[model samples]
Target: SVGLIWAQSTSGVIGRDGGIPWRLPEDLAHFKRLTMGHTVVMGRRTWDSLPAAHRPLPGRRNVVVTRQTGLVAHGAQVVGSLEQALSPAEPDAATWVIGGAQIYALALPLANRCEVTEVDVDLPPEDEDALAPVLDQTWAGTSGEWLVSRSGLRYRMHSYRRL
Candidate 1:
């Protein structure tokens, strides 16, 4: 299965002034537990946004989709496109598409599943760049569901399946 994951906070902020704004350590812990042994695909900016210690997200394979020639990062492999990044996996194996906006936009069309954390809040207009694209009728084949958390953040985890 193709999985995508992201968490947005009450202010609808996926990333704060420059980092994540939420205190839900459980969300991250869950993310780490689920993705530990899989391959994660992301865009260049997302790869760059990671802290040095988390660059490769220990115990998982990291693949960065980039167009820059010879761009390389320690503990991560760079591929020219989404197809290249997924080349090593069979259809039956699970691969996750982790993101910044561009990667999410590109992967949305091809993904079978999307795991998004929806926060019941709005963000400042200045933070527009951090928001993912709005889900629309085009994703008709996709479905969304929530995963309840005790964080009081009132967030729901959505799972969408492509038609």
Candidate 2:
């Protein structure tokens, strides 16, 4: 089960500035639940955006993609390319393509499903400036879908599978 997962607003913003523009504990919790105990691959910026103490998320393998050959990420493996980064994923278990925008954009085609938290809000200007260039297909459509949640907030987890 190779996939990418993230939360985005109605305007297609996954994040802005240095981190997410808003706080949604429920969405964070949802992310943690699915990614726990699995291999997660992300870009250097995504790793840095994490709290210093959480540089390498615990209970899972951390793979960081960076152009810098010697960029040291304590407790994490560094790779120069996406292909090398994904080499460690467990075949029978899910290897998550977790993000910063560039990483997500590159990983999308390699993914089988995109588990997204669809927020009902649109991004404010500052948030818009910090936008990920594009979620490309996400802003438009997906081949198939599943409704995962609609509980605590004006958000829902939708699963998008390839055709």
Candidate 3:
């Protein structure tokens, strides 16, 4: 399966000030479960934004997209384009575009599935730096029942498939 996955606030904000604006351990667990053992593609900035301890996101293949030549990601492969980044995905396994704004936009058209965590909080517009890609009519989605996070945040996971 080829997919895109992300978490976004009600305001459509996926990121703010170079990092995600909220902390939802439940959502992080959900992400880890879904992408574990799969090939994950990301932009260089996304890779850099990860905490040092989780930089390589163990148990998975990390492919970073960047234009910088000779840039090395200790446990990941660096490629110049999305096409090249996806080439390493296993034929019968999952390959996910786990992002930053630009990388998601580049992969959206090619994604067959999307897994999004819908966060209930809406941050101020000024605080939003990155938004989730708009899913057009070509895709249809089904959302699961809302669940409360450990911090009492309400969120739901939406799974989408290309029509």
Candidate 4:
């Protein structure tokens, strides 16, 4: 089976001016649990944004996509493309696509599921550039189904299975 998982924040936002925007502790915990022990693929900028302590994400196999030569992180493997990064995922194992922007764009087309944290609010005008790309109707309508969360944040989790 093709294994693809895409994760992103809901606020249409991911990073702030230079750091992470939201502080949803519960959502992050959920993400950590779901992605643990899996192969995680991300872009160079996403890898660089992580704190040193969080760099390999502990129990997971980290794969960073980049064009730079010798671009390996201490505890992570580096590859030039999504196909190369995903080459090692076993048929029975799940692989997560973590991102900044470009990585998400590339993986969205092939993703089997999308784990999004929907924030009810829109991005601040001043922080427009900090927002992730809007999920167009074609992608959202045809892709995932929303699930209600018990969390009081009114967040919805969407899972898009490949057709």
lDDT tens digits, residues 1-163, model 2? 6788888776777777768876677788888899999888999988989897677898888999999998989989899999888776445388998887888878877777778887766675562443443445544444223333445336767666766
Indicate which candidate wins on TM-score: 3
- Clashing pairs for predicted structure model 4, backbone only: none
* Runs of candidate 2 exceeding 4 Å displacement: 89-92, 125-153
Off by over 4 Å in 4: 1-11, 89-92, 125-130, 133-154
- For model 1, the stretches where C-alpha displacement exceeds 4 angstroms are 9-13, 16-18, 89-92, 138-152
Worst 10 residues of 1 by lDDT: 138-147
Ranking by lDDT: 3, 2, 1, 4
Best by lDDT: 3
Listed in order, each prediction's TM-score against the native is 0.79, 0.82, 0.95, 0.77
- The stretch of ten residues in a row with the least summed lDDT in candidate 4 is 1-10
* Residue-by-residue lDDT tens digits, candidate 1, 1-163: 6777777654445664556655565577767877888898888888888888899878988889989979978899889998787677444277998886777778777777766667665566463457665556654433345555577555665665655
Q: What do the candidate models score in CA lDDT, each in turn?
A: 0.72, 0.76, 0.90, 0.66
* 31: Cα error in model 3, Å: 0.5
lDDT, candidate 3, at 94: 86
lDDT of candidate 4 over 1-163, digit per residue (tens): 2333333455466666555654555566777888888788888888888887898789988889999968758889888888787677444278888776778777776765666665544556353444464555545323234544455444455554544
lDDT of 3 by residue, 1-163 (tens): 6899999998889987778999999998989999999888999989999998889998888999999979988999899999888776445388999998999999998899999999999686664488899999999999999999889899999999999
